[PDB]
Amino acid sequence: MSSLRHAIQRRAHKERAQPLERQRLGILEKKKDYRLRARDYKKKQAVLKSLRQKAAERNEDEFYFGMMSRKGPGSALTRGKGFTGTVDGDRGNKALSVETVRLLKTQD
Amino acid sequence: FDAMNSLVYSPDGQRIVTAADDGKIKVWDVESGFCIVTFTEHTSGVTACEFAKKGSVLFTASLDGSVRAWDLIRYRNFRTFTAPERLSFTCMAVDPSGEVIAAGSIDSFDIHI
Amino acid sequence: FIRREQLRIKKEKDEAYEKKFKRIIAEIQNEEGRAANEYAREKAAR
Amino acid sequence: SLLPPDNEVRRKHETLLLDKLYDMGILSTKAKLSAVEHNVTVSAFARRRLPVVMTRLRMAETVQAATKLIEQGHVRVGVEEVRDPAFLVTRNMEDFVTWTVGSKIKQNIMKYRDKLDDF
Amino acid sequence: GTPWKIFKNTAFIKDMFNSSLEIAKFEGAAIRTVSGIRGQIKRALSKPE
Amino acid sequence: GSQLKRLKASLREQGLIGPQKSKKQKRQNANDQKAEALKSIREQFNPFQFKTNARGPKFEVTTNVIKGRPELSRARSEEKRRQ
Amino acid sequence: MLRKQARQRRDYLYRRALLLRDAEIAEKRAKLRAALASGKPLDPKIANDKELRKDFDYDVSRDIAKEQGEIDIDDEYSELSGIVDPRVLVTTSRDPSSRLMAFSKEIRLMFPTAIRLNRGNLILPDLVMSAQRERLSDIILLHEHRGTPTAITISHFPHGPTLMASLHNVVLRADIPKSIKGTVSESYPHLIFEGFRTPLGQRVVKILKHLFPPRDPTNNAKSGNRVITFVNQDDCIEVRHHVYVRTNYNSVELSEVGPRFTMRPFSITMGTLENKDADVEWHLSQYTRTGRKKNYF
Amino acid sequence: IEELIKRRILAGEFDEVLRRRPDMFGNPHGVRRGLVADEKLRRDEEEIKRMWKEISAKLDALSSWHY
RNA sequence: GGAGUAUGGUCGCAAGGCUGAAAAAUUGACGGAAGGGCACCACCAGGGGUGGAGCCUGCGCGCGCGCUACACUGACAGAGCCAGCGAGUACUCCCUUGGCCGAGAGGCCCGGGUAAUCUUGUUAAACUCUGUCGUGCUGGGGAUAGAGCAUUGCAAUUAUUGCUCUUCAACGAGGAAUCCCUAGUAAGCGCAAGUCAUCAGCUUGCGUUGAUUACGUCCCUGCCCUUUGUACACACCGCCCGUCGCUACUACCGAU
């Protein structure tokens, strides 16, 4: 049980460190750090597998009405060197009319 | 009393034969305007009908899955063709020798011979 | 050859150990539970 | 059901009925007659209609917009344009419903994807 | 030993043996990382002995 | 020729597979070897028991083709390791 | 066409999930039918379910048909089992060697209806595309190490399973001389399978025996002169290819005509060769504790 | 392996899939296409055949002859 | 207490040797002749390997996969200048632009990137052009070898790899054979990954450039099949052949 064990039965076992001749390579990854690494990789691969399923089973004739108010991801040919697959969003700025810029420049 | 799906002249040119979605095909004579025989073995709408070069045999495909083959000197379908998996043929052609029938449907993309 | 021999020996040894101790624990539990139920029956009649 | 269970015509017409309903897309399985007991349903027919099946295929966004688009006549099923919003799309014509030829909706999709070929 | 080049799974491991004879003796052996990653000695490497 | 066809032809030559002879044909056979040839047939038509090259010899010298038995050699080596 | 392949694969996966739930119910319904015929008393949780009885009255007959074996299970092979001759193409890896191309020819000649294709510069999704575009039943890919083959990939189409296996002890047809070998007979081969007993073994038996065209069942027990043998020990299926004459009613002379393998499968995926992200059905569990003790197939 | 092959060939049992007829369902007897109480149960079977003719016509006409 | 499901014991049957290792058939056994179909394991037209020298996995000085060449559709030197699949650094030193220094390899100072955002338009190689060389083992080829400078690494000797000078071998299209190949196929070229089996002495992807010659015929070599069936009109064909078995009947022969 738990009362049938001495304090030397309860005593913790220490963890060894990376050798000092090899400490420049980083920390010695043990089971806990390996579990963190494996959890992050399995999570990222699960998201990527779901994205690959969604890109495979895509209707080529789909029509949402946000397509008339968004700029598409395009291709590398149409966009150019600045091509990421992400749809570009708006930063909030807008082209500003001349009367309001006349007001702002009088204030400045 | 349905939509006339297809028609072909006879190679003589005296009579034409039309195939409608009523299930019947019938052979009209050009002079006198009367149908002279109504073949009624199809149990669904009849698509394309075709002749050979010889003009004595008529091959008719339909949506009940059968390309039938009638002989117009005896008025009986000497052949009926089906695909092993069940299709519904919507178009067909026949060699002018009269020995090979090809037919194609909308359910499978293969073309049967 | 040493791989195949050691894997055969490990399978046979683990199977023999599992069989022997299943027999031993079953016989011990059987005899002890039989005597315990007989004593509970002879105690409940008093 | 009321036929005896080892009957040949019962078994043949069970397979025929289940295959017909699964080919029309009403049932989602073809291995139970309780599907025709409590799964065949006027809502199953009405969701095999055309604006709901193109809502599911994401040709439109909502069934209201889909009925508007197939009343304006952008949607063909196969090779023929469909103006009736009650055309029951079967399971093998859900692979052939698409936009019409000179469609402004098709130009909108191609202009979004930046593949607007004007030829 | 110590890893030398690390690919996705196959890693080359350097400071453990001295010759391909010793590696050919210890072929197929259960090698292990400190972290807990198991592995198997697959093949001796030619150019660094 | 095929291996099937040459096997059938060699067994017809050895008389193991031919037509059902009458009693008169068996009288002729008892009026007028085959295991020694059947050993060669069962060795020749199962050529994967032994290792052979396909090219033949590189330089022909004339002076007066099974080059090794891997199955028998592996079994012999495993018996040596058992001992 | 591609939308139809995707739609039919999705319908197949949904029907398989519904079959899982319906099997969980139909294990309870088979106790009610056996208790009705034999009169042994059944569980109250089974006998007091009104939905189960009300639906049991309609769904007797498929359980009786499955008991008699009159119907076949929902499978990717049961649609076209003995109706169509399965066409199958054998291909190499990208830049094959001469012994890999001769081995590809040899295992093409193993199947009487197969064809061989030169890879060259052929991207693997377009290979899958051309297979579905020409309605092939099976593709088989080959991988060599250095003039000796080390892997097969048997993929069933339109959406069927892959079996990837590694080859060992390959003795080629192209090593023995033409005086001893000859042109292999192309008759429809008999098949024998020895040692497959698990449902996974019947799975690999199905995806291996639906590569061959169906034999005419009128007099197949005595006619036909060519046999192909798949026999497994320690889940490494070993395959021979013999040709035989029946030299008597009690004896038979065999003659080894084809290549010898002992292929070991390491991956059976419910999805074709292009899908690297398909859900696996079985894979060779190395680096586990008792994965070497446990024998599958 | 060779003796297993010889046993199967002699007492011939082969695991090849056999060529089945494509119309085993509708034509189970396999007739040739050329020159050629229980009454309650028969009446019930004929009623189901009549019902299925009507219902199959309605369902094919509602799917608009794609079937 | 009833009903199931298991687990391990106990008992009974199985568990008594005219013995001593290596058929079925009215449906069967084997062929022949004629006529078809198919095949880069066939013909025909071409192409390409391997086989010559060296290295080495594998299989049982010998062997196999390879790389590089024998040049003029070329080598060299300028100059033009064009991809695609990839990858990349946290409790860290990964992918690296630009600025100097250096002939080079490299060094050094900074810098962008956990990334469609930075490397990277990966300005890749064959390739294209304007030159030099001129058929000579020649400037084709670059093995072997000396001396030197660098990088990785705790370590480089048995030379990890990189650069410079020099040394400049065999190899003049591979022989007999043997094998493979019919369109984005043969062949050239690089870039990336390393996926529970196999694979670094390599494997598998990915792009780029992209031909000649067949695409007919069963004449050779073969393989499969018809001569029974499986549908009916037109139309055509018109009892394929041998050696035996088995069964039924008939009479014969000679011992008991």
Curated annotation (Swiss-Prot), chain A:
Localization in the cell: Nucleus, Nucleolus
Region feature Disordered, mapped onto this chain: 1-24
Keyword Aminoacyl-tRNA synthetase attached: no
Domain of life of the native organism: Eukaryota
Biased composition (Basic and acidic residues): 15-24
Chief location of this protein within or outside the cell: nucleus
Biological process, per Gene Ontology: rRNA processing
GO cellular component entries: nucleolus; small-subunit processome
Keywords, ordered alphabetically: Nucleus, Ribonucleoprotein, Ribosome biogenesis, rRNA processing
Described purpose of this protein according to its UniProt entry: Involved in nucleolar processing of pre-18S ribosomal RNA.
Description of how the protein assembles with itself and partners: Component of the ribosomal small subunit (SSU) processome composed of at least 40 protein subunits and snoRNA U3. Interacts with snoRNA U3.
Family affiliation: Belongs to the UTP11 family.
Protein name: U3 small nucleolar RNA-associated protein 11
Organism, as annotated: Chaetomium thermophilum (strain DSM 1495 / CBS 144.50 / IMI 039719) (Thermochaetoides thermophila)
Gene: UTP11
Residues of the full protein shown: 1 to 108 of 270
